[PDB]
Amino acid sequence: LRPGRIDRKIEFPPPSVAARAEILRIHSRKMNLTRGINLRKVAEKMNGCSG
Amino acid sequence: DDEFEDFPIDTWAENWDDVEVDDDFTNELKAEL
Amino acid sequence: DPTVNRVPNYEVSEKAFLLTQSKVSIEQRKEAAEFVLAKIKEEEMAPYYKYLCEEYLVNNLNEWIKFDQELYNELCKKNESKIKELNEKIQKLEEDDEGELEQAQAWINLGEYYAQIGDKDNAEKTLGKSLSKAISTGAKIDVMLTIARLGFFYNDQLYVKEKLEAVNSMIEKGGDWERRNRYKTYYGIHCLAVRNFKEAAKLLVDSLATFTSIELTSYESIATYASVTGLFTLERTDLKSKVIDSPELLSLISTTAALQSISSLTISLYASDYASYFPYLLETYANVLIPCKYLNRHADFFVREMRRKVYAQLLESYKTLSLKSMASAFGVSVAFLDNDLGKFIPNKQLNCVIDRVNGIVETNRPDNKNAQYHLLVKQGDGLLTKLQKYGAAVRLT
């Protein structure tokens, strides 16, 4: 943590509901999906889980 | 390579059959009786 | 939410083709004219306005869409200003030397606005240059699906064919099933367009479940196309499990008159409702085939084979049916039925011989060995002629 050494301290906070929706969408483009799946509703149900 | 000058070019001064159309046959005259 | 965006708008070309047919009703033609003029005003179809006014309509009516030069110049100036703005964005990103993802995205923006007004050539150049980057395969799939959608927009089916074969060639380098279902729907629509109906039946029947490509057409029209092809090709078992019991169709039947008519025709055929089959066929021909685009060119082909299918279904079971009984069943005159049935026999499409002295329609059962042998002989002759031609070409070289 001393300055001069390792420089940038970057935060990865646990994903928010929008971030969770984006991650679910990204990983959901790998399987046959029925039309009109409300992924935003599923992510909104998914609380605490991350990545 | 031959020009085929003996045979002049003629001057002018997904598909098979189905060249005819049935149109509106209807034939309601049977429905009349 | 992600979307490939409704660019180009398919309804523009849909109502353009609806307008360009005298067979359709005048009221529907005027409704299409109102819609197309409104969309030209709003979404700036200035190049497409020019194309529609100079070709298409007046190529073959045409009073409603009158080529106004002033309206062709004002909207064109606005379009050129927007293109200039997009060029400024691309050049500013290049000057800032940002990430190559961003420059690729700017290329997509330029190309999608070029598609948004109708210019095929410059849009194709922009998206071809856009592909030159090392962007992810999904972005490439979306871009070349955009050129495929453009090809659908201008009704050039060979353009769509080359775009979709390009899709299939590189689809094995991806694997994302959503991006493959998009291509499946596009390929099914293209196959339905050029008089195939065999692959089209399968892909459209499958696509009723996974249809996220709303930028090609609405879900109702996809259901209509799938029902039409399934009726036109499938056998009495496949109809019972794909088009008459599919919950996707069951939930959507009572939503559109065209879907209702097609479903009624299908259920009449499957339920042996031979009494009202012909009026239902005429209603479907009037309401589902002519108004559309990919089907109106096949209005005769679908109608001719439907009569053949109903005749085959009627004459498969019975062996000595009488002409009078057949005419009573179909609600037509006996002479008209004989005239209609005299067209499917000479080509050996149907299976029967009409005994006009008595009226008996005695059935003839062929042997599949004979037909298979003739087909094999024809195919072998074709392949051998092709091979001889190619060999003559290559041996001289």
Side-chain angles (χ1 to χ4, degrees), chain B residues 3-31:
Chain B
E3 301 315 349
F4 278 123
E5 320 206 306
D6 46 355
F7 292 93
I9 179 46
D10 64 322
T11 183
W12 287 127
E14 55 113 0
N15 206 329
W16 175 209
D17 199 21
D18 315 48
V19 84
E20 258 307 316
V21 74
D22 177 37
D23 307 81
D24 178 43
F25 62 98
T26 296
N27 283 4
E28 82 305 317
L29 59 165
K30 149 83 166 192

Side-chain angles (χ1 to χ4, degrees), chain A residues 22 25 28-36 40, chain C residues 1-2 176-179 181 208-211 219:
Chain A
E22 294 283 354
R25 271 183 30 221
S28 87
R29 304 166 332 173
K30 308 283 169 189
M31 40 195 56
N32 214 350
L33 261 176
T34 283
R35 65 156 300 104
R40 200 85 59 168
Chain C
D1 80 89
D176 32 9
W177 250 86
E178 171 263 358
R179 288 208 156 87
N181 275 193
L208 282 183
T210 95
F211 178 61
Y219 189 41

Side-chain angles (χ1 to χ4, degrees), chain C residues 43-107:
Chain C
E43 274 276 352
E44 323 154 338
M45 323 333 297
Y48 206 69
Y49 186 70
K50 155 212 73 55
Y51 156 74
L52 198 147
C53 292
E54 303 319 88
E55 303 105 294
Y56 219 46
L57 261 184
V58 314
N59 253 7
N60 233 346
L61 299 198
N62 331 290
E63 51 273 8
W64 318 270
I65 309 312
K66 33 209 167 292
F67 190 51
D68 188 14
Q69 259 300 326
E70 153 59 34
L71 271 195
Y72 167 70
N73 308 130
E74 155 200 350
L75 283 63
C76 163
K77 162 182 179 179
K78 194 35 163 295
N79 293 358
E80 289 318 300
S81 307
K82 303 267 196 172
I83 294 152
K84 160 216 185 194
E85 300 146 18
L86 285 182
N87 296 142
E88 296 168 53
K89 311 316 174 277
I90 301 164
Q91 287 137 21
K92 94 152 177 297
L93 298 172
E94 192 51 44
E95 197 81 33
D96 288 324
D97 281 314
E98 284 187 17
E100 72 88 19
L101 270 287
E102 186 40 59
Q103 75 207 22
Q105 163 72 210
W107 276 110

Side-chain angles (χ1 to χ4, degrees), chain C residues 123-151:
Chain C
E124 171 269 305
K125 305 153 196 147
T126 45
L127 311 209
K129 170 64 200 37
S130 80
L131 164 42
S132 321
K133 320 288 192 184
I135 205 146
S136 45
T137 68
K140 302 178 178 181
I141 292 187
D142 280 22
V143 166
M144 104 166 49
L145 262 293
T146 311
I147 312 92
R149 194 196 336 170
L150 258 191

Side-chain angles (χ1 to χ4, degrees), chain C residues 44-288:
Chain C
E44 323 154 338
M45 323 333 297
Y48 206 69
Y49 186 70
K50 155 212 73 55
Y51 156 74
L52 198 147
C53 292
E54 303 319 88
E55 303 105 294
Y56 219 46
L57 261 184
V58 314
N59 253 7
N60 233 346
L61 299 198
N62 331 290
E63 51 273 8
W64 318 270
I65 309 312
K66 33 209 167 292
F67 190 51
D68 188 14
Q69 259 300 326
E70 153 59 34
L71 271 195
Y72 167 70
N73 308 130
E74 155 200 350
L75 283 63
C76 163
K77 162 182 179 179
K78 194 35 163 295
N79 293 358
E80 289 318 300
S81 307
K82 303 267 196 172
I83 294 152
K84 160 216 185 194
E85 300 146 18
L86 285 182
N87 296 142
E88 296 168 53
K89 311 316 174 277
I90 301 164
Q91 287 137 21
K92 94 152 177 297
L93 298 172
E94 192 51 44
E95 197 81 33
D96 288 324
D97 281 314
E98 284 187 17
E100 72 88 19
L101 270 287
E102 186 40 59
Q103 75 207 22
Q105 163 72 210
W107 276 110
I108 326 309
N109 303 140
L110 197 60
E112 67 82 32
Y113 186 76
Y114 271 170
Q116 200 170 7
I117 54 195
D119 314 298
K120 290 200 286 191
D121 40 3
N122 56 24
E124 171 269 305
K125 305 153 196 147
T126 45
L127 311 209
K129 170 64 200 37
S130 80
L131 164 42
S132 321
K133 320 288 192 184
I135 205 146
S136 45
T137 68
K140 302 178 178 181
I141 292 187
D142 280 22
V143 166
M144 104 166 49
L145 262 293
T146 311
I147 312 92
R149 194 196 336 170
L150 258 191
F152 271 143
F153 180 67
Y154 262 67
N155 225 28
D156 177 17
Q157 286 300 328
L158 194 41
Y159 201 22
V160 188
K161 180 176 181 178
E162 67 193 306
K163 286 315 118 189
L164 288 188
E165 69 85 23
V167 175
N168 173 9
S169 55
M170 100 171 178
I171 204 68
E172 292 320 304
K173 301 170 186 176
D176 32 9
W177 250 86
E178 171 263 358
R179 288 208 156 87
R180 180 176 325 174
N181 275 193
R182 298 273 312 282
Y183 148 77
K184 264 199 166 184
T185 290
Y186 275 74
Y187 194 44
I189 290 288
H190 147 83
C191 218
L192 183 149
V194 282
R195 206 179 269 107
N196 188 9
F197 291 67
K198 166 35 62 163
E199 308 316 307
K202 202 175 312 174
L203 319 183
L204 284 289
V205 160
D206 157 278
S207 208
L208 282 183
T210 95
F211 178 61
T212 35
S213 59
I214 302 89
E215 80 290 337
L216 269 190
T217 165
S218 68
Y219 189 41
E220 300 82 346
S221 304
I222 278 295
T224 278
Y225 301 166
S227 289
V228 154
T229 62
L231 207 180
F232 168 79
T233 81
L234 297 181
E235 184 264 8
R236 220 180 188 284
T237 292
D238 327 329
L239 285 186
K240 195 42 197 171
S241 184
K242 300 273 203 179
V243 200
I244 208 49
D245 62 352
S246 165
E248 286 73 13
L249 282 191
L250 260 305
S251 68
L252 204 67
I253 278 145
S254 303
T255 51
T256 288
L259 217 292
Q260 175 187 355
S261 34
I262 289 292
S263 77
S264 208
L265 179 72
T266 306
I267 196 46
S268 68
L269 182 51
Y270 183 78
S272 315
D273 194 317
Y274 294 104
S276 47
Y277 176 85
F278 266 30
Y280 282 143
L281 168 64
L282 274 197
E283 297 155 25
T284 63
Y285 170 75
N287 296 28
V288 166

